[PDB]
Amino acid sequence: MQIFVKTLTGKTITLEVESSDTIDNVKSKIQDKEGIPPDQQRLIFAGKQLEDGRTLSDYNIQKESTLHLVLRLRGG
Amino acid sequence: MQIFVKTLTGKTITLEVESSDTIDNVKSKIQDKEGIPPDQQRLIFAGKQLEDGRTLSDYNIQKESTLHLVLRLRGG
Amino acid sequence: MQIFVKTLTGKTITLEVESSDTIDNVKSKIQDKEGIPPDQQRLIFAGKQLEDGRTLSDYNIQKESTLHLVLRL
Amino acid sequence: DNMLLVDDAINDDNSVIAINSNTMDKLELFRGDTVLVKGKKRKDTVLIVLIDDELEDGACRINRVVRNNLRIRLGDLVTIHPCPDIKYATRISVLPIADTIEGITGNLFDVFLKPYFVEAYRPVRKGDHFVVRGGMRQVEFKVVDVEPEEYAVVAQDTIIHWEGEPINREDEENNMNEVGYDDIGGCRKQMAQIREMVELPLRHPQLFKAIGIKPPRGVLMYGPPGTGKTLMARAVANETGAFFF
Amino acid sequence: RYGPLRIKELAVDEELEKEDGLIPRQKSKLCKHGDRGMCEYCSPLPPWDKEYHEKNKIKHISFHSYLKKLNENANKKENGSSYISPLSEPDFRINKRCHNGHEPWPRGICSKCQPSAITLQQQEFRMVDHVEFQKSEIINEFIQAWRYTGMQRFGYMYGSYSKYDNTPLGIKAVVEAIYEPPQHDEQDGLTMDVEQVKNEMLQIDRQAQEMGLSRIGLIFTDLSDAGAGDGSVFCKRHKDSFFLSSLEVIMAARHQTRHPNVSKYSEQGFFSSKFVTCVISGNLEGEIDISSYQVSTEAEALVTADMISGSTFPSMAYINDTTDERYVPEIFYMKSNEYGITVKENAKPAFPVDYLLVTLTHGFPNTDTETNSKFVSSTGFPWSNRQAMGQSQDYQELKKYLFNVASSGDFNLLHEKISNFHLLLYINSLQILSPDEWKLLIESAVKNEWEESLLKLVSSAGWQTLVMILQESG
Amino acid sequence: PSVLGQGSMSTRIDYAGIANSSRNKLSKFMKITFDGEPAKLDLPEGQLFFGFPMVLPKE
Ligand SMILES: Nc1ncnc2c1ncn2[C@@H]1O[C@H](COP(=O)(O)OP(=O)(O)O)[C@@H](O)[C@H]1O
Ligand SMILES: [Zn+2]
Ligand SMILES: [Zn+2]
């Protein structure tokens, strides 16, 4: 399913993945295409602390959704 | 390397020290120019509880860096 | 020695006290000067409680510093 | 010297004046120079100087709009002076004439003014008129307000405010104030008396300081009703350029 | 300047000026004419028509309507003048330099620079019409201050102005928050050094402007407890008694003179500051009703040249005496009798202040409308200068108040806790946050569409340091 | 209560003394009432006094 992910700065990328798919899959995909481990990644939607243990269906996400990614960097 | 150091009250001082230099060096300099034993000295930055045993390059602190000072007793 | 305090009234009052004494000494000085016993007095420095079981040396109170006084029954 | 003869300009630009080479040499002017031109009724304008040897020595060419603004006719004399201290217009507010804009759809600014001012640097002064010929239409406008005042150069970055209600044309004509002496006839004696009694105290006050006298202040005109007393007062006030009240 | 003055003022003034406010009227049964053509009763009613106001129980005429009346009364177009500014703030101070042949006032005066007799009269136009409190908490906390301590209070009220449809060309001042300056309140009165108050308020108002607020009045409580079982308070301010004694009137006049309202229709450019003063006294019953007032323009220009002082009579203001640097001409106050004739009575020893006031209508926003409150807050982090009570801003209260919310997430809950006026002021006072970081903080805390800005804020290292030190601190 | 005439800032500024002096106002070598004459009561900038005697409503 088409969706949009915007990082903290504002850089945006379009992803395709099923709503039933677990968000952990999207986090692993983001890691693969950005080398960012999921621990540093944190995805938010409407002020919800989305975690790798849930799927977008539980959060009730739909297509072209805007997901805000934040880097809990591991450099400190 | 030029860096800012701000105390609890608000006083700030510009110091020079190598990034590769151990943070113990900067804490000792603070002790010299303030007479504050390093145990009372807690240097913080970007939500990092810096310890005397590290060096700035570990924390990646670079020039024009401002670091805050607190005490470990119960706070400032 | 010379320190400045913000009292309840809101003005500024300068007090003299040796910096090697328990804070209860400062509380007694202020209460004697104005008449507000130290049982309810509480002192705040840079937004931090100053417990009476410690002197000023450990906190390393800088000269010409600022304290704030509050009351609590 | 600077009393250049008025003539009809070939170009339709509203801020371009063509001058003779000989006069340009006399006045030390050059192509592209912005100069302040004064005609009649104390009217003033800013014109870009262009060398033109076709005109006879001591003659200049200006278009219809500039002459209308200056309230002068072909064959007259205009005084041209340097205007080197003209700054770029920080913000120009301009409104069109209603009758001209009738039957126009879309944003008038983009249609007419946007190509007119971009890469043009046309000087604009308050109370002036400029006409834009776009496509099959021709529309006149007014220099309602200029910042800095009272005139400035409209640069590429200059902001233009075209928003505002249409301006009726009837106001300019039917309110034909600024009437000069040419609108009063048959009373030359009294007109001369009022002029010699008003202009000199105001236009040349230093005269009386040199002679060390207090000029007379009060004046009282009287006569049969309908003999143009108000008209004479208005004409004198407008010609003198004083703050009429 | 050959026309009206050129200057930029508040948006409310501009939008009000654009309107004309005419109240249409339909064919009256007394008309004698065809459908088209209106004779005398079918004409639109001007917005300044006093009959309509007094018929609808409105005591004043919505200043902008007064400006329209003045403009219509004169200034014919295309001729008749070169524009005369219709509004001029009266000034009573003697011209220090007239010199028709005489020397300055101290040792010489003529009849051309002699302040003529002043005719006090109730003003007819009130600048600001409706003072509106966004939420009951904003003033409930203020009154809770008195409840807890028992002493009086005093605090400025920041806010913003807007239209007010309920009145012809009326304005309303919506107050958003209340800031309490350091003052020494007492049983019968309150005191505060002016120097400290102004010095503090300069920076506080700078920060508020950065936040988009503005200082729009002062509010003080004059409350006493009754002998009833519950909490009841006497009504010491009614028709018979004094609505506002001399001293509060003087202070309000000074405040107005120091908060001028910029206007385009005066030679100086200012006229009749849009400053509103609110007092809490209690209605005829035991309630804690509030009120609003505003001293007229003459009183605004009267106190500047001294000429007034408090009197042991609460309802009357003493008049000073002539002396060098202060010339006080005879003051006649004009009233109306029961026979419809205006009477001028000389009152040198003392005169009532009822002629120096205009009353506004307080109220609260409709409880069935959209909510545009800047701050969903004011029940939380204790307000600034409540040292006299136990409330005290410091690290420990921040730790108790705004730690668990941030340490986990739930940004929806966090936003409301971050949109508290005093919280923002305190965190800015700490100076921990960087300037631009604080700017985006306020933009997130006082504006909608805040998700990205809030996420960026929690990203910035400043907030990380803030939370880290807060957690570490006891 | 006592503060309705005799409280803080009522003794600092002897409102009773001023009232009695105004009543017997002469060089000449306790209750307060509002039948008499006023007397100047000036206080510096920034001071408010709400201690004037109450009168209650008209009933
Ligand atoms: N040279 C002139 N002498 C007299 N009247 C003139 C002249 N030129 C025009 N008029 C006309 O004569 C009238 C003069 O009006 P005037 O008598 O000045 O008015 P007012 O009653 O205010 O004095 C106007 O209608 C004007 O247009
Ligand atoms: Zn009719
Ligand atoms: Zn004089």
mmCIF file of N, CA and C and ligand atoms in Angstrom, chain E residues 27 31-33 37-42, ligand 2:
data_model
loop_
_atom_site.group_PDB
_atom_site.id
_atom_site.type_symbol
_atom_site.label_atom_id
_atom_site.label_comp_id
_atom_site.label_asym_id
_atom_site.label_seq_id
_atom_site.Cartn_x
_atom_site.Cartn_y
_atom_site.Cartn_z
ATOM 1 N N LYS E 27 -39.619 49.695 4.275
ATOM 2 C CA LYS E 27 -40.709 50.644 4.084
ATOM 3 C C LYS E 27 -41.543 50.795 5.348
ATOM 4 N N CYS E 31 -44.797 56.030 5.137
ATOM 5 C CA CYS E 31 -44.234 56.589 3.918
ATOM 6 C C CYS E 31 -45.329 56.900 2.905
ATOM 7 N N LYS E 32 -45.086 57.930 2.095
ATOM 8 C CA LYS E 32 -45.977 58.322 1.000
ATOM 9 C C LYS E 32 -45.123 58.486 -0.255
ATOM 10 N N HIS E 33 -44.909 57.386 -0.971
ATOM 11 C CA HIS E 33 -44.099 57.396 -2.181
ATOM 12 C C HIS E 33 -44.133 56.001 -2.784
ATOM 13 N N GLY E 37 -37.485 55.246 -4.270
ATOM 14 C CA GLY E 37 -37.498 56.572 -3.686
ATOM 15 C C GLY E 37 -37.831 56.536 -2.212
ATOM 16 N N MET E 38 -36.847 56.840 -1.376
ATOM 17 C CA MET E 38 -36.981 56.779 0.072
ATOM 18 C C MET E 38 -37.015 58.197 0.620
ATOM 19 N N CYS E 39 -37.973 58.477 1.505
ATOM 20 C CA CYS E 39 -38.279 59.868 1.851
ATOM 21 C C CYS E 39 -37.526 60.359 3.085
ATOM 22 N N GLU E 40 -37.916 59.887 4.267
ATOM 23 C CA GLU E 40 -37.172 60.217 5.480
ATOM 24 C C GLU E 40 -37.101 59.097 6.500
ATOM 25 N N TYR E 41 -38.038 58.150 6.503
ATOM 26 C CA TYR E 41 -38.064 57.089 7.497
ATOM 27 C C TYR E 41 -37.502 55.780 6.974
ATOM 28 N N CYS E 42 -37.415 55.623 5.660
ATOM 29 C CA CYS E 42 -36.884 54.420 5.044
ATOM 30 C C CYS E 42 -35.384 54.491 4.803
HETATM 31 ZN ZN ZN G 2 -40.368 56.467 2.781
#
